[PDB]
């Protein structure tokens, strides 16, 4: 059952943007996608 | 590279020269006065005489 449909676009992007980049050189810390996991863990801080 | 890190450490060479260029250009104006203290004291006789 041939000729299927997959992604041609190569899989996404991780860039060290301002979430990473600030933590990158200043502390040496790096978190994959610090945006949401910073956001969500700020909001669960206020429940 | 396309990383901002490549641009970010390109910054930290510019902020190395930008302190150094003022340091050597300062050192002449500092050095300008130091010559005058030599060339006055080279032609200065001691004033007790």
XYZ file of N, CA and C in Angstrom:
288
model
N 0.870 -1.176 0.000
C 0.000 0.000 0.000
C 0.908 1.228 0.000
N 1.231 1.733 -1.188
C 2.423 2.558 -1.352
C 2.098 4.048 -1.493
N 3.164 4.849 -1.637
C 3.145 6.284 -1.945
C 2.365 7.065 -0.880
N 2.976 7.118 0.297
C 2.343 7.759 1.434
C 2.769 9.216 1.556
N 2.314 9.841 2.636
C 2.468 11.271 2.852
C 3.227 11.506 4.150
N 4.414 12.092 4.037
C 5.213 12.479 5.187
C 5.680 13.921 5.028
N 6.333 14.431 6.060
C 6.824 15.807 6.087
C 8.051 15.905 5.190
N 8.128 16.893 4.303
C 9.402 17.199 3.646
C 10.237 18.175 4.453
N 9.561 19.002 5.253
C 10.245 20.005 6.045
C 11.023 19.326 7.161
N 12.293 19.692 7.265
C 13.167 19.021 8.208
C 12.835 19.532 9.603
N 12.951 18.648 10.590
C 12.050 18.640 11.737
C 12.300 19.793 12.691
N 11.643 20.916 12.416
C 11.529 21.997 13.373
C 12.786 22.808 13.597
N 12.886 23.452 14.758
C 14.011 24.328 15.052
C 14.118 24.515 16.557
N 15.346 24.391 17.055
C 15.754 24.909 18.358
C 16.755 26.024 18.119
N 16.432 27.228 18.565
C 17.378 28.329 18.526
C 17.579 28.838 19.944
N 18.798 29.276 20.238
C 19.083 29.867 21.535
C 18.698 31.332 21.502
N 17.403 31.596 21.628
C 16.857 32.927 21.598
C 16.891 33.465 23.031
N 16.325 34.655 23.248
C 16.392 35.390 24.500
C 16.028 34.658 25.776
N 15.189 33.631 25.674
C 14.970 32.760 26.816
C 16.233 31.974 27.139
N 16.807 31.326 26.127
C 18.010 30.532 26.324
C 19.226 31.419 26.526
N 19.415 32.353 25.588
C 20.621 33.154 25.402
C 21.018 33.930 26.648
N 20.029 34.404 27.396
C 20.283 35.076 28.660
C 20.827 34.064 29.654
N 20.162 32.925 29.775
C 20.622 31.876 30.676
C 21.889 31.208 30.173
N 22.136 31.321 28.866
C 23.256 30.630 28.242
C 24.597 31.147 28.738
N 24.857 32.443 28.589
C 26.195 32.930 28.899
C 26.293 33.412 30.341
N 25.179 33.852 30.920
C 25.240 34.491 32.229
C 25.390 33.445 33.326
N 24.637 32.349 33.244
C 24.816 31.322 34.262
C 25.471 30.071 33.697
N 25.376 29.865 32.392
C 25.771 28.586 31.862
C 24.659 27.576 31.835
N 23.424 27.998 32.059
C 22.280 27.106 32.098
C 21.572 27.093 30.752
N 21.046 25.927 30.389
C 20.321 25.787 29.142
C 19.127 24.877 29.350
N 17.965 25.355 28.921
C 16.733 24.583 28.988
C 16.094 24.590 27.615
N 15.824 23.398 27.100
C 15.041 23.244 25.887
C 13.651 23.826 26.085
N 13.326 24.841 25.280
C 12.046 25.553 25.301
C 11.749 26.122 26.685
N 12.571 27.088 27.099
C 12.398 27.713 28.407
C 11.180 28.631 28.441
N 10.624 28.966 27.271
C 9.443 29.814 27.138
C 8.252 29.267 27.909
N 7.734 28.112 27.502
C 6.527 27.589 28.126
C 6.811 27.063 29.518
N 7.946 26.390 29.691
C 8.244 25.739 30.958
C 8.704 26.782 31.962
N 9.045 27.975 31.484
C 9.149 29.102 32.387
C 7.796 29.706 32.683
N 6.963 29.836 31.651
C 5.621 30.390 31.752
C 4.755 29.502 32.632
N 4.632 28.219 32.259
C 3.777 27.282 32.988
C 4.200 27.130 34.432
N 5.499 27.148 34.692
C 5.949 26.970 36.059
C 5.906 28.291 36.817
N 5.655 29.391 36.105
C 5.316 30.638 36.781
C 3.837 30.665 37.129
N 3.017 30.001 36.319
C 1.581 30.068 36.539
C 1.136 29.031 37.551
N 1.802 27.873 37.583
C 1.462 26.888 38.602
C 1.993 27.337 39.951
N 2.997 28.217 39.941
C 3.370 28.996 41.110
C 2.222 29.818 41.648
N 1.432 30.432 40.782
C 0.175 30.992 41.257
C -0.991 30.036 41.023
N -0.749 28.721 41.047
C -1.715 27.643 40.792
C -2.391 27.777 39.434
N 28.437 32.221 12.270
C 27.372 31.267 11.982
C 26.054 32.017 12.110
N 24.966 31.314 11.828
C 23.658 31.889 12.035
C 23.226 31.954 13.476
N 23.999 31.366 14.383
C 23.718 31.500 15.799
C 23.965 32.928 16.242
N 23.089 33.419 17.116
C 23.343 34.692 17.761
C 24.556 34.637 18.667
N 24.889 33.437 19.159
C 26.112 33.209 19.923
C 27.332 33.596 19.109
N 27.318 33.270 17.816
C 28.374 33.731 16.924
C 28.388 35.247 16.849
N 27.210 35.858 16.806
C 27.165 37.307 16.864
C 27.464 37.808 18.270
N 27.092 37.041 19.298
C 27.318 37.505 20.662
C 28.783 37.465 21.050
N 29.533 36.451 20.627
C 30.956 36.550 20.901
C 31.656 37.456 19.906
N 31.001 37.796 18.797
C 31.533 38.858 17.956
C 31.387 40.202 18.643
N 30.356 40.349 19.473
C 30.243 41.530 20.319
C 31.411 41.634 21.287
N 31.755 40.530 21.957
C 32.737 40.605 23.034
C 34.170 40.722 22.535
N 34.379 40.779 21.220
C 35.657 41.257 20.711
C 35.598 42.751 20.440
N 34.439 43.230 19.991
C 34.248 44.657 19.768
C 34.325 45.409 21.085
N 33.695 44.869 22.131
C 33.835 45.459 23.458
C 35.172 45.123 24.101
N 36.051 44.415 23.397
C 37.431 44.381 23.832
C 38.253 45.477 23.170
N 38.104 45.674 21.864
C 38.827 46.753 21.204
C 38.357 48.124 21.644
N 37.047 48.272 21.876
C 36.487 49.579 22.210
C 36.976 50.089 23.556
N 37.487 49.203 24.404
C 38.173 49.671 25.596
C 39.661 49.866 25.319
N 40.215 49.124 24.353
C 41.652 49.200 24.099
C 42.032 50.413 23.259
N 41.186 50.804 22.300
C 41.525 51.923 21.422
C 41.580 53.218 22.215
N 40.662 53.389 23.166
C 40.710 54.546 24.050
C 41.903 54.461 24.989
N 42.351 53.244 25.292
C 43.499 53.088 26.173
C 44.787 53.554 25.512
N 45.000 53.215 24.243
C 46.221 53.679 23.600
C 46.093 55.126 23.150
N 44.903 55.559 22.734
C 44.735 56.959 22.371
C 44.758 57.844 23.605
N 44.334 57.304 24.744
C 44.572 57.992 25.990
C 46.033 58.084 26.336
N 46.804 57.043 26.014
C 48.179 56.939 26.490
C 49.086 57.981 25.854
N 48.693 58.530 24.709
C 49.460 59.635 24.159
C 49.222 60.928 24.915
N 47.967 61.236 25.242
C 47.685 62.458 25.982
C 48.248 62.380 27.388
N 48.220 61.195 27.981
C 48.976 60.957 29.194
C 50.463 61.074 28.929
N 50.922 60.539 27.797
C 52.323 60.633 27.453
C 52.756 62.016 27.034
N 51.811 62.867 26.631
C 52.167 64.216 26.216
C 52.652 65.029 27.405
N 51.964 64.897 28.536
C 52.361 65.614 29.735
C 53.673 65.080 30.289
N 53.909 63.771 30.144
C 55.105 63.174 30.735
C 56.369 63.621 30.019
N 56.260 63.944 28.735
C 57.400 64.539 28.060
C 57.693 65.925 28.593
N 56.647 66.695 28.895
C 56.858 68.057 29.364
C 57.510 68.066 30.730
N 57.258 67.036 31.526
C 57.950 66.927 32.800
C 59.397 66.495 32.615
N 59.714 65.834 31.507
C 61.120 65.570 31.243
C 61.814 66.798 30.677
N 61.208 67.442 29.678
C 61.903 68.520 28.989
C 61.925 69.809 29.795
N 61.077 69.943 30.808
C 61.291 71.032 31.741
C 62.416 70.709 32.701
N 62.385 69.525 33.307
C 63.414 69.161 34.272
C 64.773 68.935 33.633
N 64.822 68.688 32.330
C 66.116 68.617 31.670
C 66.744 69.998 31.539
N 65.933 71.043 31.373
C 66.461 72.399 31.306
C 66.248 73.180 32.596
N 65.936 72.498 33.694
C 65.706 73.164 34.966
C 66.984 73.137 35.784
N 67.602 74.277 36.079
C 68.677 74.276 37.063
C 68.100 74.256 38.458
N 68.823 73.719 39.432
C 68.296 73.674 40.792
C 68.328 75.046 41.448
N 67.168 75.487 41.919
C 67.015 76.815 42.479
C 67.438 76.779 43.940
N 68.734 76.684 44.147
C 69.386 77.168 45.347
C 70.608 77.879 44.804
N 70.758 77.772 43.481
C 71.962 78.209 42.802
C 71.698 79.353 41.838
